[PDB]
Design a protein around this motif. Structure first.
Motif, PDB file in Angstrom:
ATOM      1  N   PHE A 197       0.849  -1.190   0.000  1.00 31.01           N
ATOM      2  CA  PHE A 197       0.000   0.000   0.000  1.00 31.01           C
ATOM      3  C   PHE A 197       0.884   1.240   0.000  1.00 31.01           C
ATOM      4  CE2 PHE A 197      -3.471   2.638   2.169  1.00 31.01           C
ATOM      5  CZ  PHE A 197      -4.122   2.858   0.975  1.00 31.01           C
ATOM      6  N   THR A 244       1.165   4.528  -0.124  1.00 29.62           N
ATOM      7  CA  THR A 244       0.352   5.739  -0.079  1.00 29.62           C
ATOM      8  C   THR A 244       1.083   6.947  -0.645  1.00 29.62           C
ATOM      9  OG1 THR A 244       1.074   6.056   2.212  1.00 29.62           O
ATOM     10  CG2 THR A 244      -1.045   4.964   1.852  1.00 29.62           C
ATOM     11  N   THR A 245       2.416   6.921  -0.667  1.00 31.34           N
ATOM     12  CA  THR A 245       3.177   8.051  -1.184  1.00 31.34           C
ATOM     13  C   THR A 245       2.936   8.281  -2.671  1.00 31.34           C
ATOM     14  OG1 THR A 245       4.894   7.641   0.474  1.00 31.34           O
ATOM     15  CG2 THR A 245       5.473   9.029  -1.405  1.00 31.34           C
ATOM     16  N   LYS A 246       2.524   7.253  -3.408  1.00 26.44           N
ATOM     17  CA  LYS A 246       2.281   7.364  -4.840  1.00 26.44           C
ATOM     18  C   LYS A 246       0.820   7.637  -5.180  1.00 26.44           C
ATOM     19  CE  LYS A 246       6.442   5.182  -6.176  1.00 26.44           C
ATOM     20  NZ  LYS A 246       7.414   6.256  -5.829  1.00 26.44           N
ATOM     21  N   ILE A 247      -0.049   7.768  -4.181  1.00 25.52           N
ATOM     22  CA  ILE A 247      -1.473   7.995  -4.416  1.00 25.52           C
ATOM     23  C   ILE A 247      -1.723   9.493  -4.571  1.00 25.52           C
ATOM     24  CG2 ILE A 247      -3.791   7.780  -3.473  1.00 25.52           C
ATOM     25  CD1 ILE A 247      -2.775   5.255  -1.992  1.00 25.52           C
ATOM     26  N   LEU A 282      -7.990   4.687  -1.918  1.00 23.28           N
ATOM     27  CA  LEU A 282      -7.796   5.167  -0.556  1.00 23.28           C
ATOM     28  C   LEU A 282      -7.922   4.064   0.486  1.00 23.28           C
ATOM     29  CD1 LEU A 282      -9.732   8.563  -0.665  1.00 23.28           C
ATOM     30  CD2 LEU A 282      -7.256   8.237  -0.551  1.00 23.28           C
TER      31      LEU A 282
END
Lengths: 51, 23, 526
Positions: C461, C463-466, C500
């Motif tokens: 997961f 999240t840094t690339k979302i 998310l």
DNA sequence: GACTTGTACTGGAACTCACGTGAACGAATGTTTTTAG
């Protein structure tokens, strides 16, 4: 408000020789940047240094 | 309690700001 | 700095084949292109966008000489995007009844790029192709395609339904299971791989994304995003040693550039509403005082001390602006991340073009890295900017090296709070069973996996690339309001929630330990 | 039963703190147009 991805890093209690708290125990809430929060750096040739 | 500011009880007395002190 | 982007899209019969339980590739490509156009339009970017559709019944391309390059239509020419393009993408673009290869479409896209970009100056040229690779094609024009792409300085990007039980769009999981891929699809994938290798080398493999993956990656704008400006200064280690350096803002919170203007309900004009501020005394008469009759003041513990702006400016702290000086060097262990301050991170490289500064900066960075040290430095953007104390530490990568600078706190910026200890409390001490349950929960909810006999953690997961969902939500709501003035705002798109949320595997594994924790831990609201 | 005095309880407002949004000025830099040598 929009949500933000965060990290809870454990933080253990630490005390000095005086026996007075300096780092409370709990969690450290660190905000993780999103993809759009970053920026692109210009390309630069890498030059090494001699010993 | 040791290391407690006299002016403001409940807050530890912060040490004076020294700055850069080379070893 | 402008750019030209030609979006090539398959609208053939195969793209409309909606496998049960999986969204059709046509819808995913439509969503990706809609996101791209929304970002380009609502960002007020001076970027030119054209659209080519291959697989349509008709033919509206300049190369339609005879029976070649058929079923290809230039839906939109190279002109600034507008709400018309979004409307056409949303409603009046339907799948075609014919199948066409992507090679003639790519040739048409290159021809459009060449012809249209004759009276305008563009720094970058990009072509994005969305296709299923389920159509017959000929390799007779591959070499000329590669030669033209290399000569004309045109970047290329491929989006496919499959990347190199339940399925969710942008769900951090497998989009297209590797069971059912057609042989023609394999041949097309191999050809695309060959083209990408022949264009950008091994780095071209990473440029073959998927619709679901691209919906939560911000990859479509990778090749058109503008570089940040540089801040030039001189890193100082003494009084006679100086190294020319350039600092960029590596990380900075991104906000909405467009604001909201207050308008009258009856008439949607901002000139019919006026906002004014007035000042009055502490009297029942509400006596009015002009702005020129106002003096700045500060509180001094129940006593008001007048302090005019001119006096403050005269007596304010003054320093030589535009300084990057090294106060000293300290062990990296003495600087803790929890003390980081500010709202930005600086990346400092050598000057624009000079070997001496690069060598000096490399020597400093390597010395700091080898000795496990960081530089406590003084930073000041300019004369007005308040000077700050920060930490600069080395950052060495296989392709580049630099100094990462982050602000540090002052003595009065630190809050001294006391918190009760938890490890020596006889009332909040967990039991062995509770600890075992928590350990099981942690094990069952690991977002990092160990690779196969290589000792390299893989993030499940990242999240840094979302991308930030707020921008996408705002763009979708604005577009819906523009196209549907007399309807309420739509709900949040499913793929946003999917991106998310963590992978379903984590939740499935965590079901049991969560129940065990609930049974063991008694929680009651007060 | 109606008024007065004294004591105790308590929810709302004032204050503070922190964050977000928008508008304005000046510094520093870069870029374009125009004019004297």
């Amino acid at each position: 408000i929009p949500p933000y991805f965060v990290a809870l890093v454990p933080q253990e209690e630490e005390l000095d020789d005086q026996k007075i708290q300096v780092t409370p125990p709990g969690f450290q809430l660190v905000f993780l940047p999103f993809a759009d929060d970053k920026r692109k750096m210009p390309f630069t040739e890498k030059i090494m240094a001699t010993p | 309690c040791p290391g407690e500011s006299l002016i403001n009880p409940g807050f530890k007395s912060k040490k004076p700001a020294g700055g850069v002190d080379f070893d | 700095n402008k750019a030209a982007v030609v979006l090539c899209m398959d609208v053939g019969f195969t793209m409309s084949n909606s496998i049960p339980g999986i969204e059709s590739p046509f819808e995913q490509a439509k969503k990706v292109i809609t996101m791209f156009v929304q970002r380009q339009v609502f960002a007020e970017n001076k970027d030119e966008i054209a659209l080519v559709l291959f697989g349509t019944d008709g033919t509206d391309n300049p190369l339609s000489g005879g029976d070649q390059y058929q079923n290809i239509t230039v839906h939109r020419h190279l002109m600034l995007p507008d709400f018309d393009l979004l409307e056409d993408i949303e409603s009046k673009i339907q799948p075609g009844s014919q199948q066409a290869d992507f090679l003639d479409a790519l040739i048409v896209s290159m021809d459009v790029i060449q012809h249209e970009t004759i009276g305008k100056k563009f720094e970058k040229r990009h072509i994005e192709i969305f296709t299923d690779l389920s159509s017959r094609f000929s390799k007779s024009q591959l070499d000329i395609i590669i030669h033209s792409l290399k000569k004309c300085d045109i970047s290329l990007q491929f989006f496919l339904p499959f990347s190199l039980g339940p399925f969710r769009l942008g769900g951090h999981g497998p989009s297209f299971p590797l069971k059912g891929i057609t042989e023609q699809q394999k041949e097309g994938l191999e050809i695309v791989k060959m083209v990408m290798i022949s264009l950008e080398g091994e780095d071209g493999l990473d440029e073959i994304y998927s619709f679901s993956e691209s919906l939560r990656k911000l990859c479509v704008f990778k090749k058109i995003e503008r570089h940040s400006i540089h801040w030039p200064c001189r890193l100082t280690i003494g009084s006679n040693l100086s190294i020319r350096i350039a600092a960029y803002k590596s990380i900075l919170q991104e906000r909405v550039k467009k604001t909201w203007t207050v308008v009258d309900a009856k008439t949607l004009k901002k000139e019919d509403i006026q906002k004014e501020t007035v000042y009055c005394l502490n009297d029942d008469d509400e006596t009015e005082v002009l702005k020129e009759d106002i003096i700045q003041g500060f509180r001094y513990g129940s006593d008001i001390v007048p302090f005019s702006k001119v006096d403050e400016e005269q007596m304010k702290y003054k320093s030589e602006g535009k300084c990057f000086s090294v106060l000293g060097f300290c062990k990296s262990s003495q600087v803790q991340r929890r003390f980081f301050m500010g709202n930005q991170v600086l990346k400092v490289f050598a000057a624009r073009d000079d070997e001496a500064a690069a060598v000096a900066l490399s020597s400093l960075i390597h010395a700091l890295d080898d000795l496990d040290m960081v530089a406590i430095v003084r930073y000041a953007y300019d004369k007005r900017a308040n000077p700050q104390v920060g930490v600069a530490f080395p950052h060495i990568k296989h392709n580049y090296e630099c100094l990462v600078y982050v602000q540090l706190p002052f003595m009065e910026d630190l809050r001294q709070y006391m918190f009760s200890s938890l490890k020596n409390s006889k009332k909040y001490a967990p039991t062995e069973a509770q600890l075992n349950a928590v350990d099981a929960l942690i094990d069952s909810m690991s977002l990092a996996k160990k690779d196969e006999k290589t000792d390299t953690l893989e993030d499940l997961f990242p999240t840094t690339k979302i991308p930030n969902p707020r921008f996408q939500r705002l763009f979708q709501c604005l577009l819906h309001r523009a196209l549907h003035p007399r309807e309420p705002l739509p709900p949040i798109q499913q793929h946003i929630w999917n991106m998310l949320n963590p992978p379903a595997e984590v939740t499935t594994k965590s079901q049991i330990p969560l129940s065990k924790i609930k049974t063991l831990f008694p929680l009651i609201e007060a």
